[PDB]
Amino acid sequence: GSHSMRYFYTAMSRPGRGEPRFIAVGYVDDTQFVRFDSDAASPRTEPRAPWIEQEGPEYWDRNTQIFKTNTQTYRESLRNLRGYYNQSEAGSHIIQRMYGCDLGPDGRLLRGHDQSAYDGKDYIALNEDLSSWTAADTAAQITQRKWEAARVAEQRRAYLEGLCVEWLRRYLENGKETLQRADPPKTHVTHHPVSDHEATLRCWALGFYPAEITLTWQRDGEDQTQDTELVETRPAGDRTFQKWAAVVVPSGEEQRYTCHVQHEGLPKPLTLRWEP
């Protein structure tokens, strides 16, 4: 199917507690594969998935050089943004960056991304054309001018259409037994009375990968969007994910309710009901 690579950078200032922390993690789809943390006893790029371990010394050294350099440039950038917003030196602030490439089911580039935020708000993003920028405010317009002057977009475009896709393809092949395996959800419906007159039906999906899934309840074949309690999809810790959806129904009316499950790993979409 479709696949993506992303790097996520977080740079956090902490006045009075040393220099800003820089952390980078890399993902293919829902699988992390590398980390770097400037706070580590010996900051270096470390593998986080077995299929990346086969990369040579030059790969690790090159990654580490890049993240060490970013640690320094992001510290300068934090200073710069503090100034752009006329902020005092007393507060802690965060720059986040997420970038990478998306491939379609044929393996060709679907689109690229290079997005930044400041204190959790959109700051600047590379447009889908990979040639122009969208700045959130007049501070970000200053970054935009700097990046335009330095032809940054042209360099991101080269990476996103080139190395990004090339490496993602390599990782997909090297990790094909996991990265290209969809594990379908194991499902069941539970029943718990909440009173004499109502009961909870909870539809469970466990052990699935990737995280993308759709869980809905219908009553008489009609979507119950407003009445359904849906927890956020959550990691199990073994690569797989979990989710449930719950509905409170009148006792006696249980068979009017159906749980529907869509997941990439499913030969056919599931329809489930409570089985007393």
Place this chain on the structure above:
Amino acid sequence: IQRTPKIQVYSRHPAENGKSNFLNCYVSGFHPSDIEVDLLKNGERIEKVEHSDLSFSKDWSFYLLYYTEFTPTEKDEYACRVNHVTLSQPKIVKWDRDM
């Protein structure tokens, strides 16, 4: 501005008393990234808890998984205790095997 953590407490595998498993606390949707998470057994902090590397969602909010091996029993109580700048006092969420 700031976003308060969502918190879920749950096991890696379906819970079976007497069978070793993993107790998870997943915190998400929060900003900024500093957060304190403890797993509790009968009210006491569990010592050797591990956690995932800091990452974030498309909306820029952070998420982390805290976990440790545990063996559920009938009477032992487990919970997750979370503090964040958005919280005036630590929040406690109890482990419920049907949740």
Place this chain on the structure above:
Amino acid sequence: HPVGDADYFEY
């Protein structure tokens, strides 16, 4: 593999 930068890249 992550992307590189020109020397002295900054926001």
